[PDB]
Amino acid sequence: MLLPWLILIPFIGGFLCWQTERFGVKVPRWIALITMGLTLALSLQLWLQGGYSLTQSAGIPQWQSEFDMPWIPRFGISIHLAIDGLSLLMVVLTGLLGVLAVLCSWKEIEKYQGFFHLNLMWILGGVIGVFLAIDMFLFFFFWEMMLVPMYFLIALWGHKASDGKTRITAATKFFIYTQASGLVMLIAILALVFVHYNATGVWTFNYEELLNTPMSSGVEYLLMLGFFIAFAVKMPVVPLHGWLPDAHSQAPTAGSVDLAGILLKTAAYGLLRFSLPLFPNASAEFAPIAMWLGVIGIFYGAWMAFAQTDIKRLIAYTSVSHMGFVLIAIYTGSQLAYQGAVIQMIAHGLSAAGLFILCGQLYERIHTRDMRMMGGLWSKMKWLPALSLFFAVATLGMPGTGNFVGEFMILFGSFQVVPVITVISTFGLVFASVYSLAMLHRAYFGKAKSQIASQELPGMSLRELFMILLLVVLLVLLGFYPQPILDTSHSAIGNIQQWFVNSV
Amino acid sequence: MNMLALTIILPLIGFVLLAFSRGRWSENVSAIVGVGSVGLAALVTAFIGVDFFANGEQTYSQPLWTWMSVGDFNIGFNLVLDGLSLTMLSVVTGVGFLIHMYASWYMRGEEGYSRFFAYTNLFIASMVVLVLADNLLLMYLGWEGVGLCSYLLIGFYYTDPKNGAAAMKAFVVTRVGDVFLAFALFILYNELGTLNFREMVELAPAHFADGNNMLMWATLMLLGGAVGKSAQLPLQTWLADAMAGPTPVSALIHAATMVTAGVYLIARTHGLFLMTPEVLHLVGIVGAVTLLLAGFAALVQTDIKRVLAYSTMSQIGYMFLALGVQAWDAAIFHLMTHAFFKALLFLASGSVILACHHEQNIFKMGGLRKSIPLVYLCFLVGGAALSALPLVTAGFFSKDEILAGAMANGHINLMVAGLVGAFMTSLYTFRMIFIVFHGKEQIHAHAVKGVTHSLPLIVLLILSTFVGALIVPPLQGVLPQTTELAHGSMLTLEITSGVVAVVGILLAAWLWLGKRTLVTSIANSAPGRLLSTWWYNAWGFDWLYDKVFVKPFLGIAWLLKRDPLNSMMNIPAVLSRFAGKGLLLSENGYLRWYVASMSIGAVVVLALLMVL
């Protein structure tokens, strides 16, 4: 019921901001803040009003709210929006990140600003629609239309048409690397539906009847690779992640909040929801390749993070290290491991968003991007580097932050299922420390005479500090007290694991 | 009595105030609030200590809230205040109180003031969490809590980068130990399910009817965690470099706070180490080989702070032996004495290096008895206890008891190790004060007089002596494995240690009382410098631990200065663009070849149809 409205407010707000662009220029900032407030209101209403602590073994079909509507009846394509417990965590996270995106874009007036915000709400609404998606075509359409408006963001707002490096390399690799694999998973969807159409005799694009379709061995394996390729180019996996640092280092850091904190979520959401249950034996065969790619991703991202000299590419290469833990979590037979991935995933978004906001904040203070050029700014800034120290501290497994409990319950479940690949995996924490300290010492520890421009520094406004203070206190409560959201996700995680166990 | 969290909240909350009053407060109010947090901690500790005496040595547990709870994974914020943990709390909330009260006077006059009293409170708070934890998890929060605080205090002076660079080697090395520590934590949950210490104690033999082979992996790798955090051979790197910070943080790190975490883990899991005897004796094996290493490196270099540091390494491993010889209460008795002398010994040295005014040498000063005898009596009291002198010393009872226990274990190599350690402690006892305080004063050490440090000096003077040895720590509340006692040979071993100490003290005094030309000759002899260079490398261990992984790590980082796999999956774009350029060059514009293309399409279509 609430789901059609909850995916449509982003699109309605873009229309109204661009409508009132003719009326005024200070309107869309204040319009956008209220519209994202309504998005979190409906999302938090579903958290509180709904039975978040529901039955742990109520089957694979279980939803607090559900919407159905005929869209293309010839294939049974329907607007099958349906919200689960873990999907509701995803919706509340993106509503909060949308508030941060529209708050960081405050006091940013240009030649056109309504165009920026209709695009801003369009891309955030696309991610919400992926998170509420049970029909395969609706899932794919939303997956691919959140991908078009970021291209305009990197192009027309990466820099205003002055340098050609903001389109022809950064934005173009971002677009092609995702869309080729999106078309791969579309033909994977179609091969799965056609083998189901031979089995039964109905053209259906719905998840519940495609869940248990009979397929011979050696056939569903190729479709599982087809799903995983599109789910491995969106979250950074080892062979195909070259788009991520270019995308984050060129887009404005509000666009980078969208590009890191929430676009990385949807691929592991799809690995939990759409790839694991549909292909149980194929995923059981593919598991060790996934573990090898996971350990390679953690070690690889940390080394490339240590070796880099700038900051946006630095945090962009932390992200690829973080997601390796999540991939190993998903491809195991443990309930605790999956519940560790969820808390690690929410904390991943919350620990990347603050760093990107602050890195963009530091650049507009000093007008210099290279990290090794500055140094010793602690005597000049009064609140930026202290808050930045805790966010760099929250990146690695420091307890009292959500990242520690996240990565570390994965390791418990991972050692429960398989010893040797887990005992390799744990060493990324040592490597997490070295790139964390490298960031901290090269940027803030030292003498302010490392740069001439490090001798005249501005002040920090109240609202940026307010939205940084909220994230640090929110992330500490998730580290100390993670029970409420684990009780929320228990049943959804449990039935996925029980199906992955029982179907093999 | 429902006041355990006040030993954690009151310090920790004070840190938050000093973490946001970044120098905007004045000197006096910042000084009072920084000392008062630890002062309230000691007072609440004393109340629960005297109530623990009123409890009849009955343990008191308090769960605040469950941390995380999955249906097979139950972790809670459980605090246990038993006899072993009360003693380890007593050391911290007294020593940190005394060390931090000195810092109220030592820190003033320079910047970074509110910053330093912020991170000291966090350092103390992390150490209290480790020794009161009831679950191995919460205790893990203690381990890397105090490690990050050692990073924030070793590299406290961020201006020059020597001490600013010395902290990360400790940080890397302590997290290697923490990986080793968490490995055993995974194995214990896989094997025995619950991580509570007592429930683990009477769950371990129930689950172990059939298979035992994998418990040695748990316990050996648990041991690898304990050793690394304080000091031991496989990971002895950072304690020389930890001296690059200020004097009060060296006392806190090296005396009784952070280095007393590896002792608490072996002692708390003593029944768990009793489940396997050979992993218990292996602690003493590694302890016996580190007393042979950690001693004479104090004699080698001319840095006073490196002197006090190699002595701490020797003493901590001396404990590991004491725990390996199944003498548990005696080892904590050694700790109860050891905290008192080391902290004062470190602190007094700081007062005189304030008076030295940038000397940092042991060979260019002399005749310091006439400058101020207060620091003279400070080193003197510390030296006597360390050397195992029988004259009104505090720690000699602890050495006598553990060697009685060690010979009750019956390991002649361990008494040989104990005998050479007593001789070696007496060697570097008075050699430092004889080479520094005796001679001629060509550079005057300007002594500073003030009641603000004299009163804690008198308190530390009256505490480090044998008056403090009369305070028996609470050891009857845990009922550990009983430290066995020997009679008849107790007087024989006591006089043997006294003779060994006296011979070492007389040899140092004979080194002093000679011309020192033979000392100069052995400090100039080529085999002497070879051994000095060999033990500059300290059995090559820092040499080996740098050149085994560091330059391979820098080499693979230099090979990863440009990202390989991003480039090697760009070759589809490279092949497509170059193949597209070739296809564009294939077009001509001359219309004869267009019609030839039409004929050559007809030829291939007919050929492709005739092969079907």
GROMACS .gro file of N, CA and C in nm, chain A residues 335-443:
model
  327
  335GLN      N    1   2.384  -1.862   0.925
  335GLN     CA    2   2.290  -1.754   0.952
  335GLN      C    3   2.361  -1.636   1.018
  336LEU      N    4   2.454  -1.664   1.108
  336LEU     CA    5   2.527  -1.557   1.176
  336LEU      C    6   2.611  -1.477   1.078
  337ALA      N    7   2.669  -1.545   0.979
  337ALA     CA    8   2.749  -1.475   0.879
  337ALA      C    9   2.666  -1.376   0.799
  338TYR      N   10   2.544  -1.413   0.762
  338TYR     CA   11   2.461  -1.322   0.684
  338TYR      C   12   2.420  -1.202   0.767
  339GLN      N   13   2.388  -1.226   0.894
  339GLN     CA   14   2.350  -1.117   0.983
  339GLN      C   15   2.468  -1.029   1.017
  340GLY      N   16   2.589  -1.083   1.010
  340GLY     CA   17   2.706  -0.997   1.018
  340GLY      C   18   2.721  -0.910   0.895
  341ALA      N   19   2.688  -0.964   0.777
  341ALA     CA   20   2.700  -0.886   0.655
  341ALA      C   21   2.606  -0.766   0.655
  342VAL      N   22   2.486  -0.782   0.709
  342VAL     CA   23   2.389  -0.673   0.710
  342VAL      C   24   2.438  -0.557   0.795
  343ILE      N   25   2.482  -0.585   0.917
  343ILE     CA   26   2.535  -0.478   1.002
  343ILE      C   27   2.663  -0.420   0.945
  344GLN      N   28   2.748  -0.502   0.884
  344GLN     CA   29   2.868  -0.449   0.819
  344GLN      C   30   2.831  -0.359   0.702
  345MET      N   31   2.726  -0.398   0.629
  345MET     CA   32   2.681  -0.323   0.513
  345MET      C   33   2.621  -0.188   0.550
  346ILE      N   34   2.536  -0.183   0.653
  346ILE     CA   35   2.482  -0.054   0.696
  346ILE      C   36   2.594   0.036   0.748
  347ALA      N   37   2.687  -0.022   0.824
  347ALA     CA   38   2.802   0.052   0.875
  347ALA      C   39   2.896   0.095   0.763
  348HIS      N   40   2.908   0.014   0.658
  348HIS     CA   41   2.985   0.054   0.541
  348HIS      C   42   2.933   0.184   0.481
  349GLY      N   43   2.802   0.194   0.462
  349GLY     CA   44   2.745   0.318   0.412
  349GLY      C   45   2.769   0.434   0.506
  350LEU      N   46   2.749   0.412   0.635
  350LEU     CA   47   2.762   0.520   0.733
  350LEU      C   48   2.907   0.562   0.754
  351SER      N   49   3.003   0.472   0.729
  351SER     CA   50   3.144   0.507   0.745
  351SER      C   51   3.208   0.561   0.619
  352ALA      N   52   3.147   0.542   0.502
  352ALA     CA   53   3.193   0.606   0.380
  352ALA      C   54   3.131   0.743   0.358
  353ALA      N   55   3.006   0.762   0.400
  353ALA     CA   56   2.938   0.890   0.379
  353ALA      C   57   3.005   1.004   0.455
  354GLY      N   58   3.038   0.982   0.582
  354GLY     CA   59   3.105   1.087   0.657
  354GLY      C   60   3.242   1.123   0.603
  355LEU      N   61   3.319   1.022   0.561
  355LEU     CA   62   3.450   1.050   0.505
  355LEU      C   63   3.442   1.130   0.376
  356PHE      N   64   3.350   1.094   0.287
  356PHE     CA   65   3.336   1.168   0.162
  356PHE      C   66   3.285   1.309   0.185
  357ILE      N   67   3.194   1.328   0.280
  357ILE     CA   68   3.147   1.463   0.308
  357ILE      C   69   3.264   1.547   0.358
  358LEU      N   70   3.345   1.489   0.447
  358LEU     CA   71   3.458   1.560   0.504
  358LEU      C   72   3.573   1.580   0.405
  359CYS      N   73   3.595   1.486   0.313
  359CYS     CA   74   3.700   1.507   0.214
  359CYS      C   75   3.663   1.620   0.120
  360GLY      N   76   3.538   1.624   0.077
  360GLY     CA   77   3.491   1.738   0.000
  360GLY      C   78   3.495   1.866   0.080
  361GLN      N   79   3.466   1.856   0.210
  361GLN     CA   80   3.471   1.974   0.295
  361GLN      C   81   3.612   2.028   0.307
  362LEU      N   82   3.710   1.939   0.322
  362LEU     CA   83   3.849   1.982   0.331
  362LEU      C   84   3.897   2.046   0.201
  363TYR      N   85   3.858   1.991   0.086
  363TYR     CA   86   3.900   2.050  -0.041
  363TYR      C   87   3.847   2.191  -0.057
  364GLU      N   88   3.722   2.215  -0.024
  364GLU     CA   89   3.671   2.349  -0.042
  364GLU      C   90   3.723   2.445   0.064
  365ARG      N   91   3.783   2.393   0.172
  365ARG     CA   92   3.854   2.479   0.266
  365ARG      C   93   3.989   2.522   0.210
  366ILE      N   94   4.065   2.430   0.151
  366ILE     CA   95   4.205   2.457   0.115
  366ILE      C   96   4.227   2.469  -0.036
  367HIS      N   97   4.131   2.428  -0.118
  367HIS     CA   98   4.146   2.429  -0.264
  367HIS      C   99   4.267   2.349  -0.311
  368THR      N  100   4.287   2.230  -0.254
  368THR     CA  101   4.397   2.142  -0.294
  368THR      C  102   4.357   1.999  -0.264
  369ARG      N  103   4.366   1.913  -0.364
  369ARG     CA  104   4.319   1.775  -0.351
  369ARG      C  105   4.427   1.677  -0.309
  370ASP      N  106   4.553   1.702  -0.344
  370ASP     CA  107   4.657   1.603  -0.320
  370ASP      C  108   4.687   1.593  -0.171
  371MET      N  109   4.692   1.470  -0.120
  371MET     CA  110   4.705   1.450   0.024
  371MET      C  111   4.845   1.482   0.071
  372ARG      N  112   4.947   1.436  -0.002
  372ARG     CA  113   5.085   1.457   0.039
  372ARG      C  114   5.130   1.601   0.025
  373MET      N  115   5.051   1.686  -0.041
  373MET     CA  116   5.090   1.826  -0.051
  373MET      C  117   5.069   1.898   0.081
  374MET      N  118   4.963   1.864   0.154
  374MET     CA  119   4.935   1.929   0.282
  374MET      C  120   5.000   1.847   0.393
  375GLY      N  121   4.961   1.875   0.516
  375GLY     CA  122   5.010   1.804   0.632
  375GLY      C  123   5.013   1.899   0.750
  376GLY      N  124   4.983   1.848   0.869
  376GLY     CA  125   4.987   1.932   0.987
  376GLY      C  126   4.883   2.042   0.990
  377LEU      N  127   4.760   2.012   0.952
  377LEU     CA  128   4.652   2.109   0.957
  377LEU      C  129   4.580   2.109   1.090
  378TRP      N  130   4.626   2.027   1.187
  378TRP     CA  131   4.555   2.016   1.313
  378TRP      C  132   4.558   2.147   1.391
  379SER      N  133   4.667   2.222   1.382
  379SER     CA  134   4.673   2.349   1.451
  379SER      C  135   4.585   2.455   1.388
  380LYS      N  136   4.530   2.430   1.268
  380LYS     CA  137   4.449   2.529   1.199
  380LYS      C  138   4.300   2.497   1.205
  381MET      N  139   4.259   2.379   1.161
  381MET     CA  140   4.119   2.340   1.175
  381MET      C  141   4.086   2.306   1.319
  382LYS      N  142   3.963   2.337   1.358
  382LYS     CA  143   3.919   2.318   1.496
  382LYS      C  144   3.828   2.197   1.518
  383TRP      N  145   3.749   2.156   1.418
  383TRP     CA  146   3.660   2.041   1.432
  383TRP      C  147   3.668   1.942   1.319
  384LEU      N  148   3.717   1.980   1.201
  384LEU     CA  149   3.725   1.884   1.091
  384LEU      C  150   3.815   1.765   1.122
  385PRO      N  151   3.940   1.781   1.164
  385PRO     CA  152   4.028   1.665   1.172
  385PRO      C  153   4.001   1.576   1.292
  386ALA      N  154   3.944   1.630   1.400
  386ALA     CA  155   3.909   1.545   1.513
  386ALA      C  156   3.797   1.449   1.476
  387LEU      N  157   3.693   1.500   1.410
  387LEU     CA  158   3.583   1.416   1.364
  387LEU      C  159   3.629   1.322   1.255
  388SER      N  160   3.721   1.369   1.171
  388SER     CA  161   3.780   1.285   1.068
  388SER      C  162   3.866   1.176   1.126
  389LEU      N  163   3.931   1.200   1.240
  389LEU     CA  164   4.006   1.093   1.303
  389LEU      C  165   3.914   0.978   1.344
  390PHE      N  166   3.797   1.006   1.401
  390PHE     CA  167   3.710   0.895   1.437
  390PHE      C  168   3.654   0.822   1.316
  391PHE      N  169   3.630   0.891   1.205
  391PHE     CA  170   3.578   0.821   1.089
  391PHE      C  171   3.684   0.731   1.027
  392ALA      N  172   3.810   0.776   1.025
  392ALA     CA  173   3.917   0.687   0.983
  392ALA      C  174   3.936   0.573   1.083
  393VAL      N  175   3.911   0.601   1.211
  393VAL     CA  176   3.912   0.497   1.313
  393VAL      C  177   3.795   0.402   1.295
  394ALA      N  178   3.679   0.453   1.255
  394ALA     CA  179   3.565   0.365   1.232
  394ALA      C  180   3.578   0.280   1.107
  395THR      N  181   3.667   0.316   1.014
  395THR     CA  182   3.685   0.235   0.895
  395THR      C  183   3.737   0.096   0.929
  396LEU      N  184   3.842   0.087   1.008
  396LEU     CA  185   3.890  -0.045   1.049
  396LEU      C  186   3.804  -0.098   1.163
  397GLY      N  187   3.835  -0.219   1.206
  397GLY     CA  188   3.755  -0.287   1.307
  397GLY      C  189   3.780  -0.236   1.446
  398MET      N  190   3.731  -0.113   1.475
  398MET     CA  191   3.748  -0.056   1.608
  398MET      C  192   3.616  -0.066   1.683
  399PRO      N  193   3.613  -0.125   1.802
  399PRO     CA  194   3.486  -0.158   1.866
  399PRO      C  195   3.423  -0.038   1.935
  400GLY      N  196   3.291  -0.035   1.933
  400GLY     CA  197   3.218   0.088   1.950
  400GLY      C  198   3.182   0.153   1.818
  401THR      N  199   3.227   0.094   1.708
  401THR     CA  200   3.182   0.125   1.573
  401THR      C  201   3.115   0.002   1.514
  402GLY      N  202   3.024   0.025   1.420
  402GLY     CA  203   2.949  -0.086   1.364
  402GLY      C  204   3.032  -0.177   1.276
  403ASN      N  205   3.145  -0.127   1.225
  403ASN     CA  206   3.225  -0.207   1.134
  403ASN      C  207   3.288  -0.326   1.204
  404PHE      N  208   3.325  -0.311   1.331
  404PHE     CA  209   3.386  -0.422   1.403
  404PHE      C  210   3.290  -0.539   1.417
  405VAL      N  211   3.169  -0.515   1.467
  405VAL     CA  212   3.076  -0.626   1.485
  405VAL      C  213   3.037  -0.683   1.349
  406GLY      N  214   3.025  -0.599   1.248
  406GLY     CA  215   2.997  -0.649   1.115
  406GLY      C  216   3.097  -0.745   1.057
  407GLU      N  217   3.220  -0.699   1.033
  407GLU     CA  218   3.323  -0.786   0.978
  407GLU      C  219   3.350  -0.907   1.066
  408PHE      N  220   3.327  -0.896   1.196
  408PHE     CA  221   3.376  -0.999   1.285
  408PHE      C  222   3.278  -1.115   1.308
  409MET      N  223   3.147  -1.091   1.303
  409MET     CA  224   3.051  -1.201   1.295
  409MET      C  225   3.055  -1.276   1.163
  410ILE      N  226   3.086  -1.208   1.053
  410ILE     CA  227   3.117  -1.281   0.929
  410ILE      C  228   3.230  -1.380   0.953
  411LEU      N  229   3.335  -1.336   1.021
  411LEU     CA  230   3.448  -1.425   1.042
  411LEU      C  231   3.410  -1.541   1.133
  412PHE      N  232   3.323  -1.518   1.231
  412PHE     CA  233   3.276  -1.629   1.314
  412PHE      C  234   3.202  -1.732   1.230
  413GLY      N  235   3.104  -1.687   1.151
  413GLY     CA  236   3.030  -1.778   1.066
  413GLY      C  237   3.116  -1.840   0.958
  414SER      N  238   3.212  -1.763   0.906
  414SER     CA  239   3.301  -1.814   0.803
  414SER      C  240   3.392  -1.924   0.857
  415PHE      N  241   3.442  -1.909   0.979
  415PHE     CA  242   3.521  -2.017   1.037
  415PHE      C  243   3.434  -2.134   1.078
  416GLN      N  244   3.307  -2.109   1.106
  416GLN     CA  245   3.214  -2.218   1.132
  416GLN      C  246   3.199  -2.309   1.011
  417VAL      N  247   3.197  -2.252   0.891
  417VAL     CA  248   3.174  -2.331   0.770
  417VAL      C  249   3.304  -2.382   0.708
  418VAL      N  250   3.412  -2.305   0.708
  418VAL     CA  251   3.531  -2.347   0.634
  418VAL      C  252   3.653  -2.280   0.696
  419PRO      N  253   3.756  -2.355   0.740
  419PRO     CA  254   3.861  -2.290   0.819
  419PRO      C  255   3.960  -2.208   0.737
  420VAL      N  256   4.009  -2.265   0.628
  420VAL     CA  257   4.134  -2.217   0.571
  420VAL      C  258   4.117  -2.085   0.496
  421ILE      N  259   4.005  -2.065   0.427
  421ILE     CA  260   3.987  -1.937   0.358
  421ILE      C  261   3.955  -1.825   0.456
  422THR      N  262   3.897  -1.858   0.571
  422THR     CA  263   3.873  -1.758   0.675
  422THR      C  264   4.002  -1.712   0.743
  423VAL      N  265   4.095  -1.804   0.768
  423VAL     CA  266   4.216  -1.767   0.840
  423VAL      C  267   4.308  -1.682   0.754
  424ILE      N  268   4.295  -1.693   0.622
  424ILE     CA  269   4.357  -1.596   0.532
  424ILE      C  270   4.285  -1.461   0.542
  425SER      N  271   4.153  -1.464   0.551
  425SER     CA  272   4.074  -1.342   0.536
  425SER      C  273   4.098  -1.245   0.650
  426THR      N  274   4.122  -1.295   0.772
  426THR     CA  275   4.128  -1.209   0.889
  426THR      C  276   4.240  -1.107   0.881
  427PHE      N  277   4.343  -1.134   0.801
  427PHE     CA  278   4.460  -1.047   0.800
  427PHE      C  279   4.433  -0.912   0.735
  428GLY      N  280   4.316  -0.892   0.673
  428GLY     CA  281   4.287  -0.763   0.616
  428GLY      C  282   4.271  -0.655   0.721
  429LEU      N  283   4.248  -0.694   0.846
  429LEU     CA  284   4.239  -0.596   0.953
  429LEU      C  285   4.372  -0.527   0.976
  430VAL      N  286   4.482  -0.602   0.967
  430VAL     CA  287   4.614  -0.542   0.981
  430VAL      C  288   4.637  -0.445   0.866
  431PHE      N  289   4.597  -0.484   0.746
  431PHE     CA  290   4.609  -0.398   0.629
  431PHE      C  291   4.510  -0.283   0.635
  432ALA      N  292   4.395  -0.304   0.697
  432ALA     CA  293   4.304  -0.192   0.720
  432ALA      C  294   4.368  -0.085   0.808
  433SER      N  295   4.440  -0.126   0.911
  433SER     CA  296   4.513  -0.031   0.994
  433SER      C  297   4.617   0.049   0.916
  434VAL      N  298   4.693  -0.015   0.826
  434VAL     CA  299   4.802   0.059   0.762
  434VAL      C  300   4.751   0.165   0.664
  435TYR      N  301   4.644   0.139   0.589
  435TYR     CA  302   4.598   0.248   0.503
  435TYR      C  303   4.519   0.352   0.583
  436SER      N  304   4.459   0.312   0.695
  436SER     CA  305   4.394   0.410   0.782
  436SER      C  306   4.495   0.507   0.843
  437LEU      N  307   4.606   0.455   0.893
  437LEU     CA  308   4.709   0.541   0.950
  437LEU      C  309   4.780   0.622   0.842
  438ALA      N  310   4.794   0.566   0.722
  438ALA     CA  311   4.854   0.640   0.612
  438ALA      C  312   4.772   0.763   0.578
  439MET      N  313   4.640   0.747   0.570
  439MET     CA  314   4.553   0.862   0.550
  439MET      C  315   4.571   0.964   0.661
  440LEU      N  316   4.568   0.918   0.786
  440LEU     CA  317   4.571   1.010   0.899
  440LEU      C  318   4.702   1.086   0.908
  441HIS      N  319   4.815   1.017   0.889
  441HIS     CA  320   4.944   1.082   0.906
  441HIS      C  321   4.981   1.172   0.788
  442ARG      N  322   4.945   1.133   0.667
  442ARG     CA  323   4.979   1.216   0.553
  442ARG      C  324   4.896   1.342   0.547
  443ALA      N  325   4.773   1.338   0.598
  443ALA     CA  326   4.685   1.453   0.588
  443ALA      C  327   4.698   1.550   0.705
   0.00000   0.00000   0.00000
